């Protein structure tokens, strides 16, 4: 005996106001956090390709990012502008 998955059917109407957002003049000025983070990632990208390691060490790195999801939420875009959503 297992519980049935409830589709939780919903329909939404997008509002034109959702896309109205203006940035500040300083938005495109990169910060010290972005400069240190991106410079570290550049050095790690070169090191990752440079290191000599077996497949088991490659699996240890990749494996940490693989297990989070077992459900999905689907949407359907209908010609009449309605957004139909449900759970599977």
């Amino acid at each position: 005996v297992r519980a049935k998955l409830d589709r939780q059917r919903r329909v939404f109407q997008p509002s034109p106001l959702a896309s109205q957002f203006e940035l500040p003049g300083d938005f495109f000025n990169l910060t010290a956090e972005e400069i240190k983070r991106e410079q570290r990632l550049r050095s790690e990208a070169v090191e990752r390709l440079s290191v000599l390691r077996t497949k088991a060490m490659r699996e240890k790195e990749e494996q940490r990012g693989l297990r989070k999801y077992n459900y999905t939420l689907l949407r359907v875009r209908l010609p009449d502008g309605c957004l139909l959503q449900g759970t599977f």
């Binding site: 010290a32 956090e33 400069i35 240190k36 410079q39 570290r40 050095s43």
Partner: protein, 269 residues
């Protein structure tokens, strides 16, 4: 420097070389340093170009003129002592020669300490361990090694703190320490510029490294140390010390350690 003088046209290289000597006299006492001596004054019998032979004669006469140019000393540098015209080595001219060679493990440690005078080191930093690993490196490589370790430590910390401006806070820079991990990384990036040349140094092998052979150890001391520790006994009996000994026998019995160990105790290269 050779390359700059050689870039000059016929008649310009000779005039410019002479002017350098005249200026040194005007500003005496003065030191003239000629870099890449093998490039400015190569062996004449090896070069068919007229200009390259002429510049050798011009340098030879300018060197001889130093008996008139009071208080002027000319120093020169070359990569190989046998790549220069032998005429320069005649009495006078370049009659003093000093072999700089390659620093040994002790010298390498001293260089690392010099190029870290301004650097804050973490407690885990071991510059002696670095000096022992940097085989074949010269001062230029150890200086670059320290520079790379500094840059890595700066990227880890300061790039998160510093402003996009001309100046940085003194406290932020002073609060940065360079760890052993940054030296290890820099060692992986550095590449020795003098690995093939023979390195001559006092070995670190001691008698404690050799098992057995108690009589051979004593024999080497008699052959190597006694001729200089007790010279009055050799003179008393009219003895001429032996110039060397040959070892023979199976491989892998310590012949290499024996030669190094006696050099070690004697503090000889």
């Amino acid at each position: 420097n050779g390359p700059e003088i050689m870039s000059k046209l016929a008649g310009e290289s000779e005039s410019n070389l002479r002017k350098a000597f005249e200026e040194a006299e005007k500003n005496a006492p003065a030191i003239i340093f000629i870099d890449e001596l093998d490039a400015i004054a190569p062996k004449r019998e090896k070069t068919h170009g007229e200009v390259e032979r002429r510049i050798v004669s011009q340098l030879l006469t300018l060197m001889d003129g130093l008996k008139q140019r009071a208080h002027v000393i000319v120093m020169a540098a070359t990569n190989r002592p046998n790549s220069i015209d032998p005429a320069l080595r005649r009495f006078g001219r370049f009659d003093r020669e000093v072999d700089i060679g390659i620093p040994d493990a002790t010298g390498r440690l001293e260089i690392l300490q010099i190029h870290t005078k301004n650097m804050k080191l973490a407690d885990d930093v071991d510059l002696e361990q670095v000096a022992n690993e940097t085989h074949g490196h010269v001062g230029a490589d150890l200086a670059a090694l320290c520079s790379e370790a500094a840059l890595q430590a700066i990227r880890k910390k300061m790039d998160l703190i510093d402003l996009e401006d001309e100046t940085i806070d003194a406290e932020v820079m002073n609060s940065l320490a360079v760890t052993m991990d940054d030296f290890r990384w820099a060692l992986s990036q550095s590449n020795p510029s003098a690995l093939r040349e023979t390195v001559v140094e006092v070995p670190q092998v001691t008698w404690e490294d050799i098992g057995g052979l108690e009589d051979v150890k004593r024999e080497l001391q008699e052959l190597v140390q006694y001729p200089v520790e007790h010279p009055d006994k050799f003179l008393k009996f009219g003895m001429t010390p032996s110039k060397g000994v040959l070892f023979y026998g199976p491989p892998g019995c310590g012949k290499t350690l024996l030669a190094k160990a006696i050099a070690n105790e004697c503090q000889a290269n």
